[PDB]
Amino acid sequence: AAKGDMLYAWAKDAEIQKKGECGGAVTALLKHALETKMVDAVVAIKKGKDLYDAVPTVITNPEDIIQTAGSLHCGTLLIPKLIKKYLNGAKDMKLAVTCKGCDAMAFYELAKRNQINLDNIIMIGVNCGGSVSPVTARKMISNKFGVDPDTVHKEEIDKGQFIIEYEGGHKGIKIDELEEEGYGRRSNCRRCKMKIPRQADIAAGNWGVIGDKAGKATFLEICSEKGANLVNSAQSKGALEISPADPKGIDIRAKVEKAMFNLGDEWRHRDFEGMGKGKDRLKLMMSESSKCIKCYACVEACPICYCIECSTKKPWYIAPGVLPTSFMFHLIRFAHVSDSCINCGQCEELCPMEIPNALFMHSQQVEIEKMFGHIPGQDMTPPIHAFVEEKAERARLDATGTDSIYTNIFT
Amino acid sequence: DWKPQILAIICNWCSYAGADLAGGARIQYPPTVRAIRVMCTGRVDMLFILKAFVEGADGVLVSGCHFGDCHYLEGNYKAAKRMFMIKNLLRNIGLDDRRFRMTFVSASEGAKWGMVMEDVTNTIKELGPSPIKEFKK
Amino acid sequence: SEIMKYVATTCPYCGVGCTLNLVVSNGKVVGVEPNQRSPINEGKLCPKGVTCWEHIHSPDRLTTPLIKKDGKFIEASWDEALDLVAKNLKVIYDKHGPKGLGFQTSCRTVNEDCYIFQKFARVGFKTNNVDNCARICHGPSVAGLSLSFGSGAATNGFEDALNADLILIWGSNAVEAHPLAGRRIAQAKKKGIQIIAVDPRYTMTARLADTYVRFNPSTHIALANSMMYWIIKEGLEDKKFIQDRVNGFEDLKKTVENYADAEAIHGVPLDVVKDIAFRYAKAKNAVIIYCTDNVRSMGNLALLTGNVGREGVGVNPLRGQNNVQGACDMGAYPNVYSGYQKCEVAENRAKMEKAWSVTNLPDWYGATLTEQINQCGDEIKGMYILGLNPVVTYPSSNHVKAQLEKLDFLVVQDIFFTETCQYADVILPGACFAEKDGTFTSGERRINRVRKAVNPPGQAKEDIHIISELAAKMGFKGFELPTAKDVWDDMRAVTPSMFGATYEKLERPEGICWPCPTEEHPGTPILHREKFATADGKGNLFGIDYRPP
Numbered sequence A: 001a002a003k004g005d006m007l008y009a010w011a012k013d014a015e016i017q018k019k020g021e022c023g024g025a026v027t028a029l030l031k032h033a034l035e036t037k038m039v040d041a042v043v044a045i046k047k048g049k050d051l052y053d054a055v056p057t058v059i060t061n062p063e064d065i066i067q068t069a070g071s072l073h074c075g076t077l078l079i080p081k082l083i084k085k086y087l088n089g090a091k092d093m094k095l096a097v098t099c100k101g102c103d104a105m106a107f108y109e110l111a112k113r114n115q116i117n118l119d120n121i122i123m124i125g126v127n128c129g130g131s132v133s134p135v136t137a138r139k140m141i142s143n144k145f146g147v148d149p150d151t152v153h154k155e156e157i158d159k160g161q162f163i164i165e166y167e168g169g170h171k172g173i174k175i176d177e178l179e180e181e182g183y184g185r186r187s188n189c190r191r192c193k194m195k196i197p198r199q200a201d202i203a204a205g206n207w208g209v210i211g212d213k214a215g216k217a218t219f220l221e222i223c224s225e226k227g228a229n230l231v232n233s234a235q236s237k238g239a240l241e242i243s244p245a246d247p248k249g250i251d252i253r254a255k256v257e258k259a260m261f262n263l264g265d266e267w268r269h270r271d272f273e274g275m276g277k278g279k280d281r282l283k284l285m286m287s288e289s290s291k292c293i294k295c296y297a298c299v300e301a302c303p304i305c306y307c308i309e310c311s312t313k314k315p316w317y318i319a320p321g322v323l324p325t326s327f328m329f330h331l332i333r334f335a336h337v338s339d340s341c342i343n344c345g346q347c348e349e350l351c352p353m354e355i356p357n358a359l360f361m362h363s364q365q366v367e368i369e370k371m372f373g374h375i376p377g378q379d380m381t382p383p384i385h386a387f388v389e390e391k392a393e394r395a396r397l398d399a400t401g402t403d404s405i406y407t408n409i410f411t
Numbered sequence B: 001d002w003k004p005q006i007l008a009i010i011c012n013w014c015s016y017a018g019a020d021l022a023g024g025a026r027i028q029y030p031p032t033v034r035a036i037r038v039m040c041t042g043r044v045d046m047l048f049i050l051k052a053f054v055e056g057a058d059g060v061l062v063s064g065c066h067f068g069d070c071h072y073l074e075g076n077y078k079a080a081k082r083m084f085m086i087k088n089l090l091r092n093i094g095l096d097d098r099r100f101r102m103t104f105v106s107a108s109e110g111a112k113w114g115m116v117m118e119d120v121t122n123t124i125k126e127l128g129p130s131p132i133k134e135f136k137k
Numbered sequence C: 001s002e003i004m005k006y007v008a009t010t011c012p013y014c015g016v017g018c019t020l021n022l023v024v025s026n027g028k029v030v031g032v033e034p035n036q037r038s039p040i041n042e043g044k045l046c047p048k049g050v051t052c053w054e055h056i057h058s059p060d061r062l063t064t065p066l067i068k069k070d071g072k073f074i075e076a077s078w079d080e081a082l083d084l085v086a087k088n089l090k091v092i093y094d095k096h097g098p099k100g101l102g103f104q105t106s107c108r109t110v111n112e113d114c115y116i117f118q119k120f121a122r123v124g125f126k127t128n129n130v131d132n133c134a135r136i137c138h139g140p141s142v143a144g145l146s147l148s149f150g151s152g153a154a155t156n157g158f159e160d161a162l163n164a165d166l167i168l169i170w171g172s173n174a175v176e177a178h179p180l181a182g183r184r185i186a187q188a189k190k191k192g193i194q195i196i197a198v199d200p201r202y203t204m205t206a207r208l209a210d211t212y213v214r215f216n217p218s219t220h221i222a223l224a225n226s227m228m229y230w231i232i233k234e235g236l237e238d239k240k241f242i243q244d245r246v247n248g249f250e251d252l253k254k255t256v257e258n259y260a261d262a263e264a265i266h267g268v269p270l271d272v273v274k275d276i277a278f279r280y281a282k283a284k285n286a287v288i289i290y291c292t293d294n295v296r297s298m299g300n301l302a303l304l305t306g307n308v309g310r311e312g313v314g315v316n317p318l319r320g321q322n323n324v325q326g327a328c329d330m331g332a333y334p335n336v337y338s339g340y341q342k343c344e345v346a347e348n349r350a351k352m353e354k355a356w357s358v359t360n361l362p363d364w365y366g367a368t369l370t371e372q373i374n375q376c377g378d379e380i381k382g383m384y385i386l387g388l389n390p391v392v393t394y395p396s397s398n399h400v401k402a403q404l405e406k407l408d409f410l411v412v413q414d415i416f417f418t419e420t421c422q423y424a425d426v427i428l429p430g431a432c433f434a435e436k437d438g439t440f441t442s443g444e445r446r447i448n449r450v451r452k453a454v455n456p457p458g459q460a461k462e463d464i465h466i467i468s469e470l471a472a473k474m475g476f477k478g479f480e481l482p483t484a485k486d487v488w489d490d491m492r493a494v495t496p497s498m499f500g501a502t503y504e505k506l507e508r509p510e511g512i513c514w515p516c517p518t519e520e521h522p523g524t525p526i527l528h529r530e531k532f533a534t535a536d537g538k539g540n541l542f543g544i545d546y547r548p549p
């Protein structure tokens, strides 16, 4: 109700409240915004087929958001780059977009680079504990769970285990055990630490809802005045119920978030030391990147790659026809993106040659971050090279205690 | 059989002037570094450095004006930030980051230019041939 | 209308059959998006798939029929053009029988249009002069692999090679062509699987291999004969397999025993030959990836080492065209009706007659593409070309032009104004993969759905519609098929296999593999499960002597 309130929210409409993963508050808020004409469209995820297929959808008929209700954990896609490419960057039309932590970070990166209009976009953020590739989820269920994947009705990551509901009953396996066996959440999701999107306008989740509402209420955190207005309007027009959250719920929400931070740190560690150190890391990187067939899927899918023509396409950098392409191709992406990589994983998961693009880029990003102190995707802070400052530059030269840029820079 | 290949990118207004002053004063140093001469060091893009290192520069040097003495009021702050980030990238791709450095040489420091030349040559000789030239194959 | 609508479709550019989403805004295809649900490619596409959407809405697309009226083509109505075509085809028929006509389709086309095209060519005027690109394209290997096994198709799938120990790429640029088939090689080497490449040149798919072997070009027979000689000599052949499921071993014995030292022919030293031969024969599950005698030698190797009917093994010759397998399946060859039902056998000849309500089917071996083009004036006159550009594709383009101008009433159906179009008398505009609604068939025998994204540009129509309207003009019964589903159901009634591949089953993202004889059958991703498809049910392995050119 005011920019910081933590609430329990569920839908007045019983059908919306049934089809919601929790209380249907994301689908009641989106429906209200559409039908009261705050927004001209709504960009949400719906199942196109079996629940393993997540299809983004622009919806203008308020009658079609009941189809968007429910959370697809196999939806590993990224929304904001689609709004720039096929919705003209939301420069003329207001939208309301449901987004995960990576989708909120991408919104802010593209708004920094002036590619979308966050004055027009409303971001309803969802908590995210991780996403699974659809085909990997299928193999998981066929092998480890011993079930025919077409039998599954719903499937969710709850309490750190992979619950599936099929005909016959339900099952559960620890996601950590699956991830050791070679399955589970995506690699970047294991390394992710953007669990509650507090940079969005509303943050909805199933964490901190305790007691009589454990499966029929959504924990709402109001993160901005725009979200406060949307929530107050929905509550007054009577599309959404609001009760103040339970302090014990707030506490255990904080504890689960903190534990997820620690797990993300552990995976960051084990992955980045798994890549190697010294000339071994150069042979890993160079031998992996020698596979690239120049499909440019990584460039076209990256949120940070907004350039009309990539420098990887310019003949004075990359020879046009030489297919065993140079390491310069990936050096040009390390130089341009690694300062602000939101670890969305799209580059890694769309690569036909299975190159760990996201692992390399995030390994560079984490310590560009601990060097310059710039966290990508949180707010309108300009990129590090788009805003250089006199005093800060003096400061980093004096901190080296040296007359040049040569040594005493790293530990 | 091996001679270091060091490439320098020196600004026109202090580092080129300093190198010219060293030459005029007849300060000797080994003939291992070849320079490019851009207007400011703000012109130096990261892709220039990375292109040099991937073509096989055993070392790269970028020389410019002291902080507060750029001909174009603040163009070497941008270069300094860029080269700090380049140092970080080379360390994390596993190439030895001491193959790269950025020195601030004024227009009157011909002696310091000679000393920079000597030290860059010595450091690259200690480091040895770059690994990219064999990792390519 | 619609803003950013996703439509799932198959890529039309090679035989992998990757799935992709076309983005359709206000009835215009505005981009290609990943489809992460697909088993074939998990949302991953090559440059061709990424930019497949560019050619759809080009201004150069044919929009209305054209008629050559004493010179440059003038604009015609559908009724006018079709009545002209029907009249001219009718007269050429009535003068020169079924030998006088000639049909050839492309492998770019959907299965329903290939099937209705061959049905048009046979149900009406009974001619088997029907054919497609696969002849002039790289591989007549289908005949050789058919002789070896029984089915010229690839024995296993693409995901299947993840189960081997010894992927053996042989003379293949699997990452230049079929990059998402070569993705399996990348995944396998990441899993730590022995990979041996044998191409004549150090290709980007030979980079991925643990061992790379040069040989002098045009020496596959000699190299494979040497490898089989060493396998036989040290006795790493599979005795149960050879004694139970294979025939011809003595003939192979004689033929290969003259290839102990073939360094003269192929450049490979005897040490490297023994290395690859023994690694292959010792691997428990080894898969060959190939890209006539050349493919039968591969069959010889697989049969000799017993590497055929099982997970993680087999022979996978890569096709190269998006629906070449589908066209051959539908029966756009001179000798096969559909599902490789030979026309030489009166049994299914009479079955075709009864099913199609037509009598006296030809039974003679038709004329292939080059056969037709060479006899294009002597006895063939009148030709329908469904999507070909022969003047640009065949060698001796000037000879092709001479033969085509020697021809009475060429009819050409295309989406673009090609070079072959100038020699046409009628030009019927067509639809591309974004306007059709049929199926493709991958090189791994998988039937994938093609979905309609937009409408054909102007007055252009899709091929089932054109051929049905032409057959209704000419008075042919059996072409009352208004949809690709009805065409598919007619084909399924005709063919013994593919009877289980209903569209309600093809709407699954997984698709269906071709030997699917019943409606509850899940498909046959691995062929020759425990018996082959020849007369005794046993593979025959042949003895080929190397012919120096």
Ligand SMILES: Cc1cc2nc3c(=O)[nH]c(=O)nc-3n(C[C@H](O)[C@H](O)[C@H](O)COP(=O)(O)OP(=O)(O)OC[C@H]3O[C@@H](n4cnc5c(N)ncnc54)[C@H](O)[C@@H]3O)c2cc1C
Residues within 6 Å of the ligand: A019, A020, A021, A022, A023, A024, A025, A026, A027, A030, A044, A045, A046, A054, A068, A069, A070, A071, A072, A073, A074, A075, A076, A077, A098, A099, A100, A126, A127, A128, A129, A130, A131, A157, A204, A205, A206, A207, A218
């Ligand atoms: C992959 C994934 C993982 C999640 N993990 C957690 C977790 O660990 N803990 C937790 O507390 N919450 C998690 N959530 C959020 C959880 O589902 C929320 O409790 C829920 O969104 C509350 O909303 P609701 O039920 O009230 O409304 P709903 O009716 O469920 O609305 C859900 C909204 O999310 C949209 N959506 C569905 N799938 C996606 C997707 N893949 N990407 C983007 N938007 C999508 C739908 O279109 C809809 O608008 C996750 C969500 C997703 C998509």
Ligand code: SF4
Residues within 6 Å of the ligand: A100, A101, A102, A103, A128, A129, A130, A131, A188, A189, A190, A192, A193, A194, A195, A343, A344
């Ligand atoms: S990257 Fe982070 S926010 Fe995005 S889906 Fe994975 S875990 Fe959730």
Ligand code: SF4
Residues within 6 Å of the ligand: A291, A292, A293, A294, A295, A296, A297, A298, A299, A347, A350, A351, A352, A353, A354, A355, A357
């Ligand atoms: S997605 Fe992979 S294969 Fe394609 S250009 Fe990027 S790194 Fe290369």
Ligand code: SF4
Residues within 6 Å of the ligand: A301, A302, A303, A304, A337, A340, A341, A342, A343, A344, A345, A346, A347, A348, A357, A358, A361, A362
């Ligand atoms: S480089 Fe890859 S992981 Fe990083 S932001 Fe871009 S797409 Fe996401």
Ligand code: SF4
Residues within 6 Å of the ligand: A299, A304, A305, A306, A307, A309, A310, A311, A312, A332, A333, A336, A337
């Ligand atoms: S890699 Fe650099 S040049 Fe290329 S699109 Fe991304 S930001 Fe632009």
Ligand code: SF4
Residues within 6 Å of the ligand: C011, C012, C013, C014, C015, C016, C017, C018, C041, C045, C046, C047, C048, C049, C050, C178, C179, C180, C181
């Ligand atoms: S691999 Fe073949 S089918 Fe797949 S996108 Fe590339 S060209 Fe198209």
Ligand code: FES
Residues within 6 Å of the ligand: B011, B012, B013, B014, B015, B039, B040, B041, B042, B063, B064, B065, B070, B071, B072, B075, B076
């Ligand atoms: S003028 Fe030399 S650094 Fe700018």
